[PDB]
Amino acid sequence: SPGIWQLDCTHLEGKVILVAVHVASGYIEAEVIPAETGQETAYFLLKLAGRWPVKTVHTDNGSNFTSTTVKAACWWAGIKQEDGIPYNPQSQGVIESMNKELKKIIGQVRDQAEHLKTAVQMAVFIHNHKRKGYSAGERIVDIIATDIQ
Amino acid sequence: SPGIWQLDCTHLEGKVILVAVHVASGYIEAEVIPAETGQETAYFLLKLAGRWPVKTVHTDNGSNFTSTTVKAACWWAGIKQEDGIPYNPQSQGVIESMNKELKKIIGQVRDQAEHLKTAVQMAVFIHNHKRKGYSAGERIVDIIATDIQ
Ligand SMILES: Cc1cc(CO)nn1-c1ccccc1CN
Numbered sequence: 559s560p561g562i563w564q565l566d567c568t569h570l571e572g573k574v575i576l577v578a579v580h581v582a583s584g585y586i587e588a589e590v591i592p593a594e595t596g597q598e599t600a601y602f603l604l605k606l607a608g609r610w611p612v613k614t615v616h617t618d619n620g621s622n623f624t625s626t627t628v629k630a631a632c633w634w635a636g637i638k639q640e641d642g643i644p645y646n647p648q649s650q651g652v653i654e655s656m657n658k659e660l661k662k663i664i665g666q667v668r669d670q671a672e673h674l675k676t677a678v679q680m681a682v683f684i685h686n687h688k689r690k691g692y693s694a695g696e697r698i699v700d701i702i703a704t705d706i707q
Numbered sequence: 708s709p710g711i712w713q714l715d716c717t718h719l720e721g722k723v724i725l726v727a728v729h730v731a732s733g734y735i736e737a738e739v740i741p742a743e744t745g746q747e748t749a750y751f752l753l754k755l756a757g758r759w760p761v762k763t764v765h766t767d768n769g770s771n772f773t774s775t776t777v778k779a780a781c782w783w784a785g786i787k788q789e790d791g792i793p794y795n796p797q798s799q800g801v802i803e804s805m806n807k808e809l810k811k812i813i814g815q816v817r818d819q820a821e822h823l824k825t826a827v828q829m830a831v832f833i834h835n836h837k838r839k840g841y842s843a844g845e846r847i848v849d850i851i852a853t854d855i856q
């Protein structure tokens with residue numbers, strides 16, 4: 559469970575926001591992309607896995623699960639590619655709630671930012687620092703550190 | 708020291724590679740950008756600080772130190788902006804050695820990847836996972852976790 563991530567794709571301003579959630583902590587990384595292609599998803603996973611110890615990724619949909627390019631990136635980066643079927647039904651609600659929260663924060667910034675990508679990274683910052691009391695950023699580091707030891 | 712990062716800008720294929728190094732661990736994040744502007748550097752720092760607890764950044768040059776946009780990003784993200792003057796002269800050598808190493812890895816993968824940005828992220832992955840025996844990725848998490856506790 560320290561190495562389990564879930565992909566999530568949401569839309570805003572006619573643009574695509576690709577999100578990776580560290581399931582145990584709620585910590586996220588995100589990027590704005592023109593469209594969710596296998597290539598874009600593969601590149602995003604490469605970046606993620608160079609930065610955190612990504613053991614398993616639950617893909618956000620069947621197209622990214624099927625994608626040879628995504629499979630190739632998972633092979634390259636040593637990631638077990640899995641489906642994202644909500645066997646525990648609460649998983650749908652959790653992801654939906656996060657997308658709502660993220661969009662709310664995006665709305666709260668951007669009087670401040672010209673470009674959506676800046677607003678999305680501001681939202682990532684606020685989400686990961688928010689105390690709920692530890693933050694998601696604190697939880698992910700503690701979870702992974704405990705695993706190392 | 709858990710929160711201290713150093714910026715580093717290096718060049719390859721007529722392109723700019725912007726690197727942030729976590730000084731205590733040797734862990735890095737990097738991106739390819741068309742040119743090192745204040746705007747690009749500011750955005751890079753925003754991304755970094757949303758992902759790791761960035762307390763202090765030693766800027767890579769005087770232009771980024773001076774930049775109002777970089778100063779604004781540091782304000783936004785709660786980062787202390789500092790110079791990168793090598794008061795300890797070994798710091799020059801360390802950064803140069805890292806740039807050499809990074810370019811070497813890029814060369815080793817360059818044929819697997821069409822685009823330089825992909826090769827750079829492969830290099831980030833290899834660098835952060837390399838056992839020296841802990842990896843830089845392991846060291847950064849342990850350093851920050853110990854600071855939290
Ligand atoms: C790791 C990764 C990211 C992307 C997409 O940018 N492709 N791969 C990949 C995967 C396997 C082989 C070659 C490549 C490079 N094309």
Ligand SMILES: Cc1cc(CO)nn1-c1ccccc1CN
Pocket residue numbers: 670671672676746749750753776779780781783784
């Ligand atoms: C945090 C950050 C990154 C960048 C550059 O993309 N600017 N800022 C910034 C900083 C302060 C205010 C508004 C903005 C938004 N322009």
